[PDB]
Design a protein around this ligand. Structure first.
Ligand SMILES: c1ccc(CNc2ccc(OC[C@H]3CCCN3)cc2)cc1
Ligand SMILES: [Yb+3]
Ligand SMILES: [Yb+3]
Ligand SMILES: [Yb+3]
Ligand SMILES: [Zn+2]
Length: 606
């Protein structure tokens, strides 16, 4: 594991974490103890190494006495390794508890601390975590590798008017004995998980039940809207259970975060985290929920052993997601989404360049910050490989049989690409000659678009392409023929695909874009996917009226899918360049630490 400085699982492994901590909003620190139950995998083990990042270590206690530890030099985005001297040498399989008193930095990359004004209610502050990929070390000392799976329990002291939630079953609450202005929330996660799945939020939260095993959680002002948006959740769980086997996590709760949440969603066990940019008013962005649900099998049960193997998580999860959405809304819709995805892959490959190492399916992360490598490639090249295998090997019913067997086989494990490929070949031993037709070396190890494109139903895509083509080939004297009725029979998804089709050919003449606003009134659509793509098209087509709209969307939410390209478009437009860097500089301090880092790199600032 090239992204971790800890002792590998061949040396020792964490089986359990007990976390007791207090969330201090005045200092923006989390302070407490992490008791790691560690099992030796070696004879005569006398030291072990943990990952840390910007932690302050007070002391390390084993068998009731303090022990020697040392922090090595910081290795950039990897943090600093912490070597611990064991008081007694351990034999193979022996376990001990190591209890570490620690405190986080206010500047912890795993965490965003929000002032009251940054929330809906404007009364209370808010804290949230996002550990994936390698930020759990910025919360607590751990072996920060998905190659190790541990259970955990926690007790978290927070100001009594706030609520703590984690990726775990809620285990009760009480006043804090040590300070009656506080409450302690307790948590148990009894299913072994990789440490990137450890998550905390603390805020003025409320919940509403929306299914037999689902509460939606948010600040008071979003609860009603969220409950409606995510009402398909239980029915997606039922379908996911048909496809992946039993749901083993007990609860499936949803947490809708404040707008700065850096991603679409994070599949935290027991409590999925989603962006509020999903709240479109019509459930149209529900594929993200289906995605997060799917991770309860692919990712959370079968986990990538290292981050080089991240496509295992995402490709399988996108593949199950599109199946759930296919069940709900028809096989033509699965194909429409599948084809859209291939279009998103062309975009990423074009952005990075077609010989770029990040466009490889399996990546080598040696010396690479995983946050910098992150993109649509593992999702879409991964999905495209599985969609191609589906078609090669006899269709969706046959391939779903493999997917279910794959989950059973590697449940509670961490695996590599060769483990998966090996199982694939074993499962389809009667179709090995077909599998030997796959260019594996190209699919897995080569940059650029895949060597083969799957076959796609075009039914729902056609009208999108026909309209996109009308606009691109139009001349000035054709602009009059466009009318609000062009969009008549297009769903929100088709408007989005129409915009994506056209964005692929941007810039368009500025007169065309103005006409498009005149006839389609895209400025008035609040759907975040549609508005995102429409504003990108305006900025790339040099429409100055779109500049304050694109500045406003980039900074009013922080979902990096939207905030990173909007800022990048704005800096590439000469008329908005200085404003873009001005805006970033002003917002930087109150941005998500990783978001701030990546936007800065994108803009070449600092
Ligand atoms: C291709 C691209 C990136 C990588 C590893 N980097 C990586 C970086 C961040 C990751 O998680 C961040 C967000 C994504 C949604 C939930 N959390 C996950 C992986 C591996 C292969
Ligand atoms: Yb020994
Ligand atoms: Yb209990
Ligand atoms: Yb084999
Ligand atoms: Zn995912």
């Amino acid at each position: 594991d090239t992204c971790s400085l800890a002792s590998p699982a061949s040396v020792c492994r964490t089986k359990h974490l007990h976390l007791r901590c207090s969330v201090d909003f005045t200092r923006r620190t989390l302070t407490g103890t992490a008791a790691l139950t560690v099992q030796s995998q070696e004879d005569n083990l006398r030291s072990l190494v943990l990952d840390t990042k910007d932690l302050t270590i007070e002391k390390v206690v084993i068998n009731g006495q303090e022990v020697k530890y040392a922090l090595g030099e910081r290795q950039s985005y990897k943090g600093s390794p912490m070597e611990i001297s064991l008081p007694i040498a351990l034999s193979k399989n022996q376990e001990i508890v190591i209890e570490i008193s620690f405190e986080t930095s206010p500047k912890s990359s795993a965490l965003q601390w929000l002032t009251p004004e940054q929330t809906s209610g404007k009364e209370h502050p808010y804290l949230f975590s996002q550990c994936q990929a390698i930020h759990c070390r910025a919360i607590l000392p751990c072996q920060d590798t998905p190659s190790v799976k541990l259970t955990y329990t926690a007790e978290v002291s927070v100001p009594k008017e706030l609520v703590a939630l984690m990726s775990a079953i809620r285990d009760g609450e009480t006043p804090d004995p040590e300070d009656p202005s506080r409450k302690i929330y307790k948590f148990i996660q009894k299913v072994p998980i990789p440490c990137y799945l450890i998550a905390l939020v603390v805020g003025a939260l409320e919940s509403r039940q929306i299914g037999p095993r689902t509460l939606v959680w948010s600040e008071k002002e979003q609860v009603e809207k969220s409950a409606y948006e995510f009402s398909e959740t239980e029915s997606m769980l039922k379908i996911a259970e048909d496809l992946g086997g039993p749901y083993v996590w007990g609860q499936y709760d949803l947490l809708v975060l404040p707008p700065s949440f850096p991603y679409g969603g994070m599949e935290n066990p027991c409590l999925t985290f989603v962006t509020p940019t999903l709240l479109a008013g019509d459930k149209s962005l529900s594929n993200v929920i289906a995605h997060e649900i799917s991770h309860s099998w692919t990712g959370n049960l079968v986990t990538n052993k290292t981050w080089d193997h991240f496509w295992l998580n995402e490709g399988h999860t996108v593949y199950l997601e599109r199946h759930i959405c296919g069940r709900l809304f028809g096989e033509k819709f699965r194909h429409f989404n599948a084809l859209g995805g291939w279009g998103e892959l062309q975009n990423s490959v074009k952005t990075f360049g077609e010989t770029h190492p990040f466009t490889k399916l399996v990546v080598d992360l040696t010396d690479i910050d995983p946050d910098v490598a992150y993109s649509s490639v593992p999702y879409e090249k991964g999905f495209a490989l599985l969609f191609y295998l589906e078609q090669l090997l006899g269709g969706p019913e046959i391939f779903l049989g493999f997917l279910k067997a794959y989950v059973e086989k590697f449940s509670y494990k961490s695996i590599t690409t060769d483990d998966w490929k090996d199982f694939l070949y074993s499962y389809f031993k009667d179709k090995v000659d077909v599998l030997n037709q796959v260019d594996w070396n190209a699919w897995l190890y080569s940059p650029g678009l895949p060597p083969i494109k799957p076959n796609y139903d075009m039914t729902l895509t056609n009208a999108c392409i026909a309209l996109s083509q009308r606009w691109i080939t139009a001349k000035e004297d054709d602009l009059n023929s466009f009318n609000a009725t062009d969009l008549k029979d297009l769903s929100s998804h088709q408007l989005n695909e129409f915009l994506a089709q056209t964005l692929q050919r941007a810039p368009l003449p500025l007169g065309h874009i103005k006409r498009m606003q005149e006839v389609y009134n895209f400025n008035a659509i609040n759907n975040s996917e549609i508005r995102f793509r429409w504003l990108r098209l305006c900025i790339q087509s040099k429409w100055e009226d779109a500049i304050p709209l694109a500045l406003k969307m980039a900074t009013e939410q922080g979902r990096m899918k939207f905030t990173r390209p909007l800022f990048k478009d704005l800096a590439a437009f000469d008329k908005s360049h200085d404003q873009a860097v001005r805006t970033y500089q002003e917002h930087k301090a109150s941005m998500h630490p990783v978001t701030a880092m990546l936007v800065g790199k994108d803009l070449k600032v600092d």
